[PDB]
Design an enzyme around this catalytic site. Structure first.
Site, PDB file in Angstrom:
ATOM      1  N   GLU A  59      18.951   2.197  -2.876  1.00  0.00           N
ATOM      2  CA  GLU A  59      19.843   1.080  -3.115  1.00  0.00           C
ATOM      3  C   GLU A  59      19.016  -0.146  -3.484  1.00  0.00           C
ATOM      4  O   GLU A  59      17.905  -0.344  -2.967  1.00  0.00           O
ATOM      5  CB  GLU A  59      20.701   0.778  -1.891  1.00  0.00           C
ATOM      6  CG  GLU A  59      21.442  -0.545  -2.024  1.00  0.00           C
ATOM      7  CD  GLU A  59      22.484  -0.782  -0.960  1.00  0.00           C
ATOM      8  OE1 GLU A  59      22.545  -0.020   0.032  1.00  0.00           O
ATOM      9  OE2 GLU A  59      23.254  -1.758  -1.122  1.00  0.00           O
ATOM     10  N   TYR A  60      19.567  -0.958  -4.379  1.00  0.00           N
ATOM     11  CA  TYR A  60      18.926  -2.194  -4.799  1.00  0.00           C
ATOM     12  C   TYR A  60      19.668  -3.362  -4.161  1.00  0.00           C
ATOM     13  O   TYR A  60      20.886  -3.490  -4.320  1.00  0.00           O
ATOM     14  CB  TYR A  60      18.903  -2.302  -6.322  1.00  0.00           C
ATOM     15  CG  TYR A  60      18.701  -3.703  -6.840  1.00  0.00           C
ATOM     16  CD1 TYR A  60      19.765  -4.417  -7.389  1.00  0.00           C
ATOM     17  CD2 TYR A  60      17.455  -4.326  -6.770  1.00  0.00           C
ATOM     18  CE1 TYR A  60      19.594  -5.707  -7.862  1.00  0.00           C
ATOM     19  CE2 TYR A  60      17.274  -5.619  -7.240  1.00  0.00           C
ATOM     20  CZ  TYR A  60      18.345  -6.304  -7.790  1.00  0.00           C
ATOM     21  OH  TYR A  60      18.174  -7.587  -8.258  1.00  0.00           O
ATOM     22  N   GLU A  78       9.900  -8.170   7.033  1.00  0.00           N
ATOM     23  CA  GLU A  78       9.464  -7.530   5.788  1.00  0.00           C
ATOM     24  C   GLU A  78      10.239  -6.248   5.444  1.00  0.00           C
ATOM     25  O   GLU A  78      10.130  -5.758   4.319  1.00  0.00           O
ATOM     26  CB  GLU A  78       7.965  -7.219   5.845  1.00  0.00           C
ATOM     27  CG  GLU A  78       7.074  -8.425   6.142  1.00  0.00           C
ATOM     28  CD  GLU A  78       5.936  -8.100   7.094  1.00  0.00           C
ATOM     29  OE1 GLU A  78       4.762  -8.275   6.702  1.00  0.00           O
ATOM     30  OE2 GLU A  78       6.213  -7.672   8.234  1.00  0.00           O
ATOM     31  N   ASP A  99      13.292   0.513   4.596  1.00  0.00           N
ATOM     32  CA  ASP A  99      12.068   1.160   5.067  1.00  0.00           C
ATOM     33  C   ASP A  99      12.191   1.721   6.477  1.00  0.00           C
ATOM     34  O   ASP A  99      11.854   1.057   7.464  1.00  0.00           O
ATOM     35  CB  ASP A  99      10.865   0.201   4.974  1.00  0.00           C
ATOM     36  CG  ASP A  99       9.544   0.932   4.743  1.00  0.00           C
ATOM     37  OD1 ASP A  99       9.336   2.027   5.311  1.00  0.00           O
ATOM     38  OD2 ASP A  99       8.706   0.403   3.984  1.00  0.00           O
ATOM     39  N   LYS A 124      11.239   3.030  -5.409  1.00  0.00           N
ATOM     40  CA  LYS A 124       9.976   2.998  -4.675  1.00  0.00           C
ATOM     41  C   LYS A 124       9.208   4.280  -4.968  1.00  0.00           C
ATOM     42  O   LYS A 124       9.657   5.368  -4.594  1.00  0.00           O
ATOM     43  CB  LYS A 124      10.231   2.884  -3.172  1.00  0.00           C
ATOM     44  N   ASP A 147      10.157  -0.289  13.868  1.00  0.00           N
ATOM     45  CA  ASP A 147       9.472  -1.260  13.003  1.00  0.00           C
ATOM     46  C   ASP A 147      10.371  -2.328  12.368  1.00  0.00           C
ATOM     47  O   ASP A 147      10.436  -2.461  11.144  1.00  0.00           O
ATOM     48  CB  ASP A 147       8.708  -0.505  11.916  1.00  0.00           C
ATOM     49  CG  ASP A 147       7.792  -1.411  11.112  1.00  0.00           C
ATOM     50  OD1 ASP A 147       6.917  -2.104  11.726  1.00  0.00           O
ATOM     51  OD2 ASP A 147       7.953  -1.455   9.876  1.00  0.00           O
ATOM     52  N   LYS A 153       0.852  -1.181   0.000  1.00  0.00           N
ATOM     53  CA  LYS A 153       0.000   0.000   0.000  1.00  0.00           C
ATOM     54  C   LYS A 153       0.896   1.242   0.000  1.00  0.00           C
ATOM     55  O   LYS A 153       2.032   1.204   0.484  1.00  0.00           O
ATOM     56  CB  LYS A 153      -0.945   0.009   1.201  1.00  0.00           C
TER      57      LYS A 153
HETATM   58  C1  LIG Z   1      13.765  -1.362  -2.173  1.00  0.00           C
HETATM   59  C2  LIG Z   1      14.642  -2.492  -2.628  1.00  0.00           C
HETATM   60  C3  LIG Z   1      14.019  -3.691  -2.915  1.00  0.00           C
HETATM   61  C4  LIG Z   1      15.048  -4.538  -3.304  1.00  0.00           C
HETATM   62  N1  LIG Z   1      15.142  -5.827  -3.691  1.00  0.00           N
HETATM   63  C5  LIG Z   1      14.088  -6.685  -3.766  1.00  0.00           C
HETATM   64  N2  LIG Z   1      12.846  -6.388  -3.331  1.00  0.00           N
HETATM   65  C6  LIG Z   1      11.794  -7.238  -3.461  1.00  0.00           C
HETATM   66  C7  LIG Z   1      10.476  -6.881  -2.938  1.00  0.00           C
HETATM   67  C8  LIG Z   1      10.299  -5.796  -2.178  1.00  0.00           C
HETATM   68  C9  LIG Z   1       8.930  -5.516  -1.720  1.00  0.00           C
HETATM   69  C10 LIG Z   1       8.497  -4.201  -1.648  1.00  0.00           C
HETATM   70  C11 LIG Z   1       7.173  -3.923  -1.330  1.00  0.00           C
HETATM   71  C12 LIG Z   1       6.279  -4.972  -1.096  1.00  0.00           C
HETATM   72  C13 LIG Z   1       6.708  -6.294  -1.182  1.00  0.00           C
HETATM   73  C14 LIG Z   1       8.030  -6.568  -1.492  1.00  0.00           C
HETATM   74  N3  LIG Z   1      11.886  -8.468  -4.010  1.00  0.00           N
HETATM   75  C15 LIG Z   1      13.061  -8.894  -4.487  1.00  0.00           C
HETATM   76  C16 LIG Z   1      13.176 -10.136  -5.064  1.00  0.00           C
HETATM   77  C17 LIG Z   1      14.418 -10.548  -5.566  1.00  0.00           C
HETATM   78  N4  LIG Z   1      14.586 -11.810  -6.138  1.00  0.00           N
HETATM   79  C18 LIG Z   1      15.809 -12.187  -6.840  1.00  0.00           C
HETATM   80  C19 LIG Z   1      16.526 -12.950  -5.726  1.00  0.00           C
HETATM   81  N5  LIG Z   1      15.677 -14.084  -5.278  1.00  0.00           N
HETATM   82  C20 LIG Z   1      16.355 -14.851  -4.217  1.00  0.00           C
HETATM   83  C21 LIG Z   1      14.335 -13.652  -4.818  1.00  0.00           C
HETATM   84  C22 LIG Z   1      13.632 -12.892  -5.933  1.00  0.00           C
HETATM   85  C23 LIG Z   1      15.533  -9.710  -5.456  1.00  0.00           C
HETATM   86  C24 LIG Z   1      15.454  -8.464  -4.896  1.00  0.00           C
HETATM   87  C25 LIG Z   1      14.249  -8.011  -4.401  1.00  0.00           C
HETATM   88  N6  LIG Z   1      16.243  -3.901  -3.271  1.00  0.00           N
HETATM   89  N7  LIG Z   1      15.948  -2.602  -2.833  1.00  0.00           N
END
Ligand SMILES: Cc1cc(Nc2nc(/C=C/c3ccccc3)nc3cc(N4CCN(C)CC4)ccc23)n[nH]1
Length: 258
Positions: free
Chosen positions: A85-86, A134, A148, A36, A130, A17
């Site tokens: 950052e990713y 997650e 977050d 984001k 928090d 959300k």
């Molecule tokens: C902000 C940020 C996110 C992020 N990386 C990742 N976020 C989210 C999911 C995030 C998320 C956000 C809102 C709601 C639900 C999930 N899912 C991801 C899934 C990823 N993969 C590739 C690696 N696998 C092991 C799992 C699937 C990799 C990075 C991810 N790096 N920086």
């Protein structure tokens, strides 16, 4: 100063959300990053506008290898964007979903890194509050990373589900830096067991359990883990240890990874 026409959007990473977050690339540098986007519509319609501007500024200058970096932000007509950052191995929440539980070596490692990241956060009077799975992402090396800062706060204050909140904040009251050590105990419990120690199925059951610190360990939690957890899960904040001490607790030391 940035705009959206400077990045190209990759796949969606996740949707909460407020807004979604996508993989992205800086068109000039070819830098890989997270984007984001948060919807100014739902921002006015939830009053968290002052909480986000607080979120941005606080993390906008926290730098630590287990804290997700926020490089910048910008807004257009309908929405605002954080350029983050990713973290390439996803969330601690999802690897917990897929593994059911973690072993000691693994959790001891996460707790160590989170302690360090927290200890630093403290050294600039920033309380996170928090800390659920997650909000924990993993970088290239599978190292934990605090994402977050949606509800962080500077200095002691008096300001969803309560599974991770301490007795202090739950029953109104004033709270300090020690709230994150409750959280850390709750986390270390969920890492080892598969559920936070006070899970129930109505909000006030959980409230009562937290209020009176009521949790049990299944049989496979070790003598060393039980000690640590009972140590951090104390109704009285000041009775909880310091991050220095938890870093040095023998179960962490014997099982963590250097
Ligand atoms: C902000 C940020 C996110 C992020 N990386 C990742 N976020 C989210 C999911 C995030 C998320 C956000 C809102 C709601 C639900 C999930 N899912 C991801 C899934 C990823 N993969 C590739 C690696 N696998 C092991 C799992 C699937 C990799 C990075 C991810 N790096 N920086």
């Amino acid at each position: 100063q940035w705009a959206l026409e400077d990045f190209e959007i990759g796949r969606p990473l996740g949707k909460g959300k407020f807004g979604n977050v996508y993989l992205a690339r800086e068109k000039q540098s070819k830098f890989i990053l997270a984007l984001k986007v948060l919807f100014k519509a739902q921002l006015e319609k939830a009053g968290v506008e002052h909480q986000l501007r607080r979120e941005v500024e606080i993390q906008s200058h926290l730098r630590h290898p287990n804290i997700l970096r926020l490089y910048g932000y910008f807004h257009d007509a309908t929405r605002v964007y954080l350029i983050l950052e990713y973290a390439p191995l996803g969330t601690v929440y999802r690897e917990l979903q897929k593994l059911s539980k973690f072993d000691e070596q693994r959790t001891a490692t996460y707790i160590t890194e989170l302690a360090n990241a927290l200890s630093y956060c403290h050294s600039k009077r920033v309380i996170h509050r928090d800390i659920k799975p997650e909000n924990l992402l993993l970088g290239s090396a599978g190292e934990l990373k605090i994402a977050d800062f949606g509800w962080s706060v500077h200095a002691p204050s008096s300001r969803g589900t309560l599974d991770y909140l301490p007795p202090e904040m739950i029953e109104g009251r004033m709270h300090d830096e020690k709230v994150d050590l409750w959280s850390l105990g709750v986390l270390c419990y969920e890492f080892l067991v598969g559920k936070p120690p006070f899970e129930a199925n109505t909000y006030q059951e959980t409230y009562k359990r937290i209020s009176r610190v009521e949790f049990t360990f299944p049989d496979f939690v070790t003598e060393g883990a039980r000690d640590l957890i009972s140590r951090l899960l104390k109704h009285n904040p000041s009775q909880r240890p310091m991050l220095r001490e938890v870093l040095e607790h023998p179960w962490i030391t014997a099982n963590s990874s250097k």
